[PDB]
Amino acid sequence: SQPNNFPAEIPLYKQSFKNWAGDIKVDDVWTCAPRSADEVVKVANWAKDNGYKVRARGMMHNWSPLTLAAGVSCPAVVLLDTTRYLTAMSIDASGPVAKVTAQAGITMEALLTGLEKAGLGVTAAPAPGDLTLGGVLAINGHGTAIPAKGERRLAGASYGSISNLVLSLTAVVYDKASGAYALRKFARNDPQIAPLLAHVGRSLIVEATLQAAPNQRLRCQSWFNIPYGEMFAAAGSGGRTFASYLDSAGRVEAIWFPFTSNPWLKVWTVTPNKPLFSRQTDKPFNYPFSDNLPDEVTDLANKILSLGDGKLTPAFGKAQFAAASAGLVATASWDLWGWSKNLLLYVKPTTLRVTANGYAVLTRRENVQRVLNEFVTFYQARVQAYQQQGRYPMNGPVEIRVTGLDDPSEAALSGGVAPALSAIRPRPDHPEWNVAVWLDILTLPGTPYANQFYREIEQWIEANFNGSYAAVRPEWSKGWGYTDQAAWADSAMLQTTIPNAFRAGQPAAANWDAAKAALAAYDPYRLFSSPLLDSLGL
Numbered sequence: 213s214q215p216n217n218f219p220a221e222i223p224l225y226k227q228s229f230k231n232w233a234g235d236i237k238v239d240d241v242w243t244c245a246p247r248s249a250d251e252v253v254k255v256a257n258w259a260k261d262n263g264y265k266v267r268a269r270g271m272m273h274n275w276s277p278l279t280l281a282a283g284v285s286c287p288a289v290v291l292l293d294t295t296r297y298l299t300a301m302s303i304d305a306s307g308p309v310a311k312v313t314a315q316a317g318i319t320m321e322a323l324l325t326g327l328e329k330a331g332l333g334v335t336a337a338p339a340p341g342d343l344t345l346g347g348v349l350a351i352n353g354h355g356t357a358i359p360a361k362g363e364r365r366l367a368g369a370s371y372g373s374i375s376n377l378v379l380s381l382t383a384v385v386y387d388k389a390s391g392a393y394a395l396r397k398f399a400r401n402d403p404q405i406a407p408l409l410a411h412v413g414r415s416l417i418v419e420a421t422l423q424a425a426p427n428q429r430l431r432c433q434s435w436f437n438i439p440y441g442e443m444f445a446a447a448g449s450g451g452r453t454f455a456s457y458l459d460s461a462g463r464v465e466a467i468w469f470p471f472t473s474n475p476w477l478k479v480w481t482v483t484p485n486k487p488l489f490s491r492q493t494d495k496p497f498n499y500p501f502s503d504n505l506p507d508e509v510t511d512l513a514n515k516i517l518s519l520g521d522g523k524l525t526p527a528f529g530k531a532q533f534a535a536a537s538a539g540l541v542a543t544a545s546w547d548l549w550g551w552s553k554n555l556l557l558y559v560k561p562t563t564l565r566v567t568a569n570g571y572a573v574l575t576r577r578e579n580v581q582r583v584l585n586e587f588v589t590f591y592q593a594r595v596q597a598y599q600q601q602g603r604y605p606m607n608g609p610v611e612i613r614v615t616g617l618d619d620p621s622e623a624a625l626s627g628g629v630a631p632a633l634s635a636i637r638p639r640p641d642h643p644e645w646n647v648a649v650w651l652d653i654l655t656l657p658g659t660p661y662a663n664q665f666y667r668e669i670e671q672w673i674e675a676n677f678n679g680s681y682a683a684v685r686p687e688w689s690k691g692w693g694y695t696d697q698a699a700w701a702d703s704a705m706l707q708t709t710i711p712n713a714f715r716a717g718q719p720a721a722a723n724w725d726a727a728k729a730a731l732a733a734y735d736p737y738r739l740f741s742s743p744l745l746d747s748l749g750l
């Protein structure tokens with residue numbers, strides 16, 4: 213069924229949709245590539261009269277079904293490929309803090325490269341460069357960074373998600389006076405912007421202005437000689453704990469392969485001059501042996517998933533650790549140095565395709581080690597319980613990152629508001645919770661028992677990280693709300709637990725219900741949604 217009366221000057225065509233993990237694949241989805249923000253608004257106003265949803269089509273990296281659902285032949289949805297034309301950017305350095313305005317289809321690699329050429333950069337960002345700015349803002353995309361002990365924040369920088377850098381944005385919003393959708397610009401100190409800073413797919417952003425700080429030189433050191441029992445030891449310290457590196461450098465990520473002893477630890481340190489033996493790099497993606505999988509790894513993945521040989525999982529984790537550790541040694545990449553974007557961007561899409569769950573655990577900075585040690589202790593014991601039964605649900609690594617919260621005091625204006633729906637929006641009732649520990653576990657899509665295992669982990673995370681100790685919000689882009697059959701399917705999590713995570717500690721005027729109401733007012737025809745967003749009641 214071809215859509216009727218579609219704007220004549222905007223070419224409409226069928227194009228398949230396939231997310232990065234490969235588990236959402238829809239054929240022949242009606243797609244167009246708007247040349248301008250005005251063309252986006254034309255498509256929205258046609259869609260409301262014709263019963264089609266409207267979603268931005270970025271790089272299709274998201275795991276959760278926020279664009280459209282899997283298994284739906286040729287949906288009543290029109291996708292707007294923002295990557296072709298909505299990519300322009302400009303920089304205004306006429307104030308005490310530089311500002312970059314960019315159309316929402318630009319990639320993070322292009323954005324950060326444009327900033328570098330102007331002497332500017334950001335504290336943290338997602339590891340891939342092949343993501344649109346609009347996709348990253350929609351789900352509070354983030355990297356890893358908190359301040360090292362003694363570090364002062366640079367004006368125009370933040371330790372939160374990319375959503376926290378927004379100073380202004382232009383969204384497609386219903387204008388009640390004219391009865392039509394139109395472009396509307398919002399300032400970061402306008403409370404009405406709050407649901408749009410990270411709208412989870414409930415809006416369409418055509419352009420945003422972000423703060424940018426003077427660019428930093430970073431060193432990025434990798435270590436594979438620290439046993440997980442030491443790295444993730446109980447608070448009570450001693451040794452090379454993950455928290456000791458947060459204090460010395462502030463920017464830390466651990467990737468811990470299954471059934472292996474030593475995680476791949478990456479530590480980024482702000483380092484003005486290149487250390488004597490560090491290798492300078494002037495490009496991003498410096499771990500080619502991680503981006504280009506060796507045959508040993510791809511062969512084991514295929515045996516495990518396609519041939520059902522799950523007992524090869526421990527060997528598979530060892531192969532993955534070998535690829536990372538011996539690969540870093542072969543490419544002389546364990547101690548790198550250069551402008552920030554070259555070290556912040558480090559994952560290409562040719563890496564191992566995996567699904568992942570994800571959670572942000574808000575807590576006091578001093579509690580990070582406890583959080584990590586608690587999660588690692590529970591995970592190891594569950595993995596063992598499953599291995600006892602001959603099951604290997606998790607065949608990818610555990611990944612740990614830590615960031616600040618989306619605290620508007622870090623935005624370079626007075627009265628900035630927190631994103632209403634960011635997973636790391638602050639908790640007014642707990643001013644002492646000032647970090648978020650991000651926890652994820654990766655596994656090949658479709659691995660037997662994965663959902664059942666992810667459900668056990670999710671139930672324990674919600675039970676454990678509670679009270680005045682910590683709180684939990686799901687990482688929107690990843691898996692959550694698990695039943696034994698699927699992710700994003702548990703009724704209690706969708707109807708009660710997640711919405712409550714956005715009411716706890718918040719004023720009624722700025723909580724889950726207020727955000728939902730504002731997004732509905734901005735989109736009365738409900739153009740901007742997918743079955744998951746409907747099931748969440750957002």
Ligand SMILES: *Cc1cc2c(cc1C)nc1c(=O)[nH]c(=O)nc-1n2C[C@H](O)[C@H](O)[C@H](O)COP(=O)(O)OP(=O)(O)OC[C@H]1O[C@@H](n2cnc3c(N)ncnc32)[C@H](O)[C@@H]1O
Nearest residue numbers: 268270271272273274316338339344346347353354413417
């Ligand atoms: C695949 C992947 C993703 C990823 C990652 C590593 C890989 C291999 N590492 C990440 C990380 O280090 N930190 C982080 O926070 N996220 C990481 N991700 C996830 C990624 O950031 C998100 O999935 C992001 O949304 C992907 O961007 P992309 O451009 O690919 O977006 P999409 O999948 O097509 O769309 C996702 C949702 O965003 C909406 N969207 C996209 N553009 C807009 C605009 N302009 N306006 C409003 N909404 C927009 C889509 O409609 C959809 O709802």
Ligand SMILES: OC[C@H]1O[C@@](CO)(O[C@H]2O[C@H](CO)[C@@H](O)[C@H](O)[C@H]2O)[C@@H](O)[C@@H]1O
Nearest residue numbers: 327328329330331332333426427428551
């Ligand atoms: O971050 C410094 C780095 O940026 C460059 C451009 O790539 O210079 C930019 O920033 C300088 C310092 O503010 C400015 O002098 C210059 O005008 C601006 O382009 C590099 O030359 C510099 O090493």
